[PDB]
Design a protein around this ligand. Structure first.
Ligand code: ADP
Lengths: 249, 134
């Protein structure tokens, strides 16, 4: 039934602008791992990235990281479209800028050390609006590709220049920061995290469904364990992974 | 009066010295500050010696400033504190530049009369950090 859209899921590969897909559904869409592909996202955006073929992921779910799920403004439980991009272009000068307050308390032409290795050999298929991120020296900071000399999406080539300047600009209200937590930020709680996800994914992504059937959902949960185990962290991560409002007492 | 003559006190509040017209041993301390930074005085000005000479509140402060050279028998416990608090207090910019967690609570437990508040005053003064007592 129109296998052009697809469901979302987390990613085991952390490298930016990278995905992984079911192995048999490579002829269906008819494209390859190296074949750079564009992917749609609400609020009228589309981001391009590399492809790969795996098996663990179902034949109906993509794998991706929080960065693109942020620029695409989409959470799990959603679905988007896709399209191969053999018409991709070699990205010439595409200006970037350190877009955060994270720029605070720092000095040096950090552009070089943080970027040159990050872009080196990655053949990163980049489009305008990218909010990619890189980490070094006890710190983790990002940049936005503000300019696309060829527009909108292109490849990175080592010859491409970087006049690296600009003043840290203000992230709008739409996007959310990398600092905000997520499932990838926790470890050692897979069993109970899965329990909670399966428990409270329907009432927040499908409340009209509950109003459509007569069933009693839970309205109270208790978590018991020693201190310093990450319970408030789990609650905030779950809130951030569904868009539901969060209140603290 | 016979000393602020053609050398009209290039000074900095905190410079203490000896000046008299007699036995030649008396201090001259900071009490007031109309200009925040130090200046060079001039005649025709106005001064009020309404203030009264005091005790060695300043000398007690100096003894506290001596700090590490005013205690004994806790060589280890004083070295652990130094390596734990000097870096955050002296160079906060380094900690600002990176994301790392400094300490915000220290607990010292021991029998009475073992010089604990004295240690706190000795550590606050040696690093120049303000100290509040409750
Ligand atoms: N399972 C975990 N995964 C990731 N970080 C953890 C985990 N457990 C503890 N931490 C770290 O330690 C802290 C956990 O303390 P906290 O969330 O306050 O637990 P509690 O609320 O039970 O005291 C967090 O700030 C987090 O960075």
């Amino acid at each position: 039934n129109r296998p052009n859209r697809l469901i979302v899921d987390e990613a085991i590969n952390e490298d930016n602008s990278v995905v992984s897909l079911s192995q048999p559904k490579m002829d269906e869409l008819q494209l390859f791992r190296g074949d750079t592909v564009l992917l749609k996202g609400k609020k009228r955006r589309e981001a391009v990235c590399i492809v790969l073929s795996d098996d663990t992921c179902s034949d109906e779910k993509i794998r991706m990281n929080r960065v693109v799920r942020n620029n695409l403004r989409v959470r799990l439980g959603d679905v988007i479209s896709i399209q191969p991009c053999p018409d991709v272009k070699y990205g010439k000068r595409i200006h970037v800028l350190p877009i955060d307050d994270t720029v605070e308390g720092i000095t040096g032409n950090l552009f070089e050390v943080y970027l040159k290795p990050y872009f080196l050999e990655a053949y990163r298929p980049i489009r305008k609006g990218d909010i990619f991120l890189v980490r070094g020296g006890m710190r983790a900071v990002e940049f936005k590709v503000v300019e696309t000399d060829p527009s909108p999406y292109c490849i990175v080539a080592p010859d491409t220049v970087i006049h690296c300047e600009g003043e840290p600009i203000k992230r709008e209200d739409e996007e959310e920061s990398l600092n905000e937590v997520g499932y990838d930020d926790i470890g050692g709680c897979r069993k109970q995290l899965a329990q909670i996800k399966e428990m409270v994914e329907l009432p927040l992504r499908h409340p009209a469904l509950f109003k459509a059937i007569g069933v009693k959902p839970p309205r109270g949960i208790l978590l018991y364990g020693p201190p310093g185990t990450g319970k408030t962290l789990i609650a905030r991560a779950v809130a951030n992974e569904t868009g539901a409002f969060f209140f603290l007492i």
